[PDB]
Ligand binder design. Structure first.
Ligand SMILES: NCCC(O)(P(=O)(O)O)P(=O)(O)O
Ligand SMILES: [Cl-]
Ligand SMILES: [Mg+2]
Ligand SMILES: [Mg+2]
Ligand SMILES: [Mg+2]
Length: 775
């Protein structure tokens, strides 16, 4: 550890060639995404054999005995898999293969072609249905499988196809279809758009086609489904239905996907993945262009996966809310009212979609601003939902196990967005992100703009490069520390890497080396000062030191005890080094501002030292007043935020994020730090807990701890709003302040009074700064 460990590190990723390579990857990714965000190559999604077979059913509008879209028949004939099924070869899902295969078999029979394909397809369906022994063998179900498959299978039965219609599993599916259809408000199908519109081809005996046009999408589709639209067309001859089918054929050529368009969801998924991989800083232009498009279509009623959906989609809406707010767009959590029954109700469609919607709702709820009760309500509901989902058999299907769904849900629930280490979350996501991830709707599908090898290649390389740069900085840090004189204060533990981690895990960009270096120096100094005032120093010694603090005179130190003479000299040097660097970056005088900051901090320590000497227990009000100042976060934060390469802070701009006595970023960070610290420790003078109990002699320790949290929770919401709020403060500065708070909140998370885990701190340093990602 310390000097020896850090100087033993020899990372290859520091060489310029690695960054040059990453820049090639960045250019390649910009070119890849260009059609999606700026061109007309939006909605890149794999073929749906199931839907393609429905489109193939449509007879020629000229009345001749052939398909209107004969290229779809040719596609089907040429794309059977080796086992006789149709679907995506890389991923096997039973329900997907069963549905697509029966769909293709029937249309080939309709047109009296592909006799060999039909024979092989029928064998696949029969063969595989007979392997289903019980419910737990069925695996994950494609959208509305229970509704559609019995219907499609009855079509086959009327043609007397050699399939096992009398299997228990078949009877069970009909039972499930009945239980789904029982909750159906049929009269409302025609009046209120609903998820069932995605699958009209499965409920043909129920739908009055003469009334169904009222809920058609503006593009002519029925909830973006080619199959459902093809069905309505064949029953109605509706011109707009045909226009939709034509538009999809024009786009894809000789097949159709199971959803179209997916313009909103795809854009959001692209952004979400780029952000989670930690590579977002390379794609500011593309992220803005993507989210600007989503925002244009953002409305009070929510959004669907495609901009023309006549009903909103919780998955896409919750994802949109979070990403838009995170990128400083003005959105309101009142959009979630669109998904309440009159509270929430999502849990009706297919399982992966429902789980995804709730994961997204859970994540969105954590970005709550003050007074947003609906998001507190959303958090509760989603948490309960996800905990229940963990106990469901569907969660442990072969398909879900292969994708580690249970693990993903568990990780989400144990993870607080506020109490996260940003660099570590990106590192962890690089280990979970799948270039070949397969999604489920009417069929299994992929979105190559979202899931691809280039994203991951860049994610791993970029992480390693940044880390190697930090490793060189840590050599500088430990080298400085060794020669600084600070190690002479043997009453204080040496922790330079812990303090470097506090800033570097959130403010990681290469250009902010000076910020990280100066922040670390000040944090090292402060830990000595803290131990001196609250432990080592006598009140009479501290009175002397505090007088020297007022004087700003090196010559005055002749009065101090030897250890204080040295301490004062180091303190004086660090303060003025930071100030010179700040003045250089900011182009204005800042020595006076820094000096006032330091004296307020240390005068705060001295007040505390007087209390200790007198065994005085403050009121909670006086404790918090003192604590916001004496905790030292304000002056530490200032020692980094004013020296960020290229980030100009006028006095006016600075006062927006730093202003003692006001609820701005540095003040809220100070309050959060003080109180989070207390909740985590305090059990291991007097803390906020103990002060509250003096104020309330009859209250229990339990009530006391609850009270401290009642102060913390609102503070965290304010911190979030202050961070994300639109203003003219350089965003890099606000992010630096916010990210230091997030890393602090990690150190103090799950406050039970027990104390901070030293082994976990070391583990965070190992993961973040020491161990690279394997390439
Ligand atoms: N900078 C915080 C230092 C403390 O939390 P610590 O207990 O010394 O870690 P304090 O109790 O002095 O406020
Ligand atoms: Cl996968
Ligand atoms: Mg202290
Ligand atoms: Mg202390
Ligand atoms: Mg403490």
């Amino acid at each position: 550890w310390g000097y020896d460990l850090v100087h033993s590190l020899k990372s290859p990723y520091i060489d310029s060639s690695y960054r040059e390579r990453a820049e090639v990857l960045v250019s390649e990714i910009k070119a890849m995404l260009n059609p999606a965000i700026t061109g007309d190559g939006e909605s890149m999604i794999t073929p749906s054999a199931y839907d393609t077979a429905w489109v193939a059913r449509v007879p020629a509008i000229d009345g001749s005995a052939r398909p209107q879209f004969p290229q779809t028949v040719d596609w089907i004939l040429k794309n059977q898999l080796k086992d006789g099924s149709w679907g995506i070869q890389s991923h096997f899902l039973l329900s997907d293969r069963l549905l697509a295969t029966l769909s293709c078999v029937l249309v080939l029979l309709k047109w009296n072609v592909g006799d060999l394909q039909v024979e092989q397809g029928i064998e696949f369906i029969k063969s595989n249905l007979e392997l289903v022994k019980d419910e737990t063998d069925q695996d994950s179900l494609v959208t509305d499988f229970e509704i559609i498959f019995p219907s499609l299978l009855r079509e086959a039965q009327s043609l007397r196809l050699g399939l096992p219609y009398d299997l228990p599993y078949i009877h069970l599916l009909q039972t499930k279809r009945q239980e789904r259809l029982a909750k159906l408000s049929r009269e409302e199908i025609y009046a209120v758009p609903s998820p069932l519109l995605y699958s009209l081809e499965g409920i043909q005996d129920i739908v009055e086609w003469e009334r169904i046009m009222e809920v058609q999408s503006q593009d002519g589709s029925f909830l973006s489904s080619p199959a459902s639209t093809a069905c309505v067309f064949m029953h109605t001859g509706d011109a707009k239905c045909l226009e939709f089918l034509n538009s999809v054929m024009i786009k894809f050529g000789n097949f159709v996907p199971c959803l179209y368009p997916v313009d909103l969801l795809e854009r959001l998924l692209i952004v979400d993945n780029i952000v989670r991989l930690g590579i977002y800083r390379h794609f500011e232009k593309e992220i803005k262009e993507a989210l600007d498009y989503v925002y244009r279509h953002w409305n009070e009623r929510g959004i669907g996966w495609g901009r023309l959906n006549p009903i909103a989609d919780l998955e896409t809406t919750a994802l949109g809310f979070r990403l838009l707010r995170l990128h400083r767009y003005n959105v309101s959590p009142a959009i979630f009212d669109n998904f309440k029954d009159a509270k929430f109700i999502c849990s009706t469609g297919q399982f992966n979609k429902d789980v995804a919607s709730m994961l997204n709702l859970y994540r969105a709820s954590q970005l709550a601003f003050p007074g947003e009760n609906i998001l507190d309500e959303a958090k509760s509901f989603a948490t309960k939902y996800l905990r229940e989902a963990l106990e469901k058999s569907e969660t442990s299907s072969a398909w879900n196990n292969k994708q580690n769904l249970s693990q993903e849900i568990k990780y989400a629930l144990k993870t607080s967005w506020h109490a996260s280490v940003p660099r570590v979350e990106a590192k962890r996501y690089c280990q979970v992100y799948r270039p070949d991830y397969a999604r489920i709707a009417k069929c299994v599908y992929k979105l190559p703009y979202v899931n691809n090898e280039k994203f991951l290649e860049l994610g791993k390389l970029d992480f390693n490069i940044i880390q190697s740069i930090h490793q060189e900085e840590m050599k500088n840090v430990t080298s400085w520390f060794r020669d600084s004189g600070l190690p002479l204060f043997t009453f204080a533990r040496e922790r330079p890497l812990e303090f470097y981690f506090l800033v570097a895990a959130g403010t990681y960009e290469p250009q902010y080396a000076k910020c990280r270096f100066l922040f670390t120096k000040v944090a090292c100094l402060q830990t000595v000062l803290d131990d001196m005032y609250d432990t080592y120093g006598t009140l009479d010694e501290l009175k002397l030191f505090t007088e020297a603090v007022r004087r700003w005179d090196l010559s005055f130190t002749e009065n101090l005890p030897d250890y204080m003479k040295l301490c004062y000299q180091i303190y004086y040097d660090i303060v003025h080094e930071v100030a010179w660097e700040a003045e250089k970056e900011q182009g204005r005088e800042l020595v006076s501002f820094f000096r006032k900051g330091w004296e307020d901090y240390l005068l705060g320590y001295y007040e505390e030292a007087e209390w200790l000497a007198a065994e005085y227990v403050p009121t909670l009000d006086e404790y918090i007043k003192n604590g916001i100042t004496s905790i030292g976060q304000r002056i530490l934060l200032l020692s980094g935020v004013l020296i960020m390469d290229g980030q100009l802070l006028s006095q006016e701009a600075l006062e927006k994020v730093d202003y003692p006595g006001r609820r701005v970023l540095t003040e809220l960070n100070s309050l959060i730090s003080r109180l989070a610290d207390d909740t985590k420790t305090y059990k291991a003078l007097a803390s906020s807990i103990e002060c509250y109990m003096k104020d309330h002699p009859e209250c229990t320790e339990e009530e006391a701890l609850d009270h401290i949290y009642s102060i913390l929770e609102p503070a965290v919401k304010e911190l979030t709003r202050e961070f994300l709020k639109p203003d003219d403060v350089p965003f890099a500065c606000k992010k630096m302040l916010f990210e230091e708070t997030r890393v602090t909140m990690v150190i103090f998370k799950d406050g039970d009074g027990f104390g901070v885990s030293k082994l976990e701190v070391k583990d965070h340093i190992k993961e973040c700064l020491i161990e690279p990602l394997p390439l």
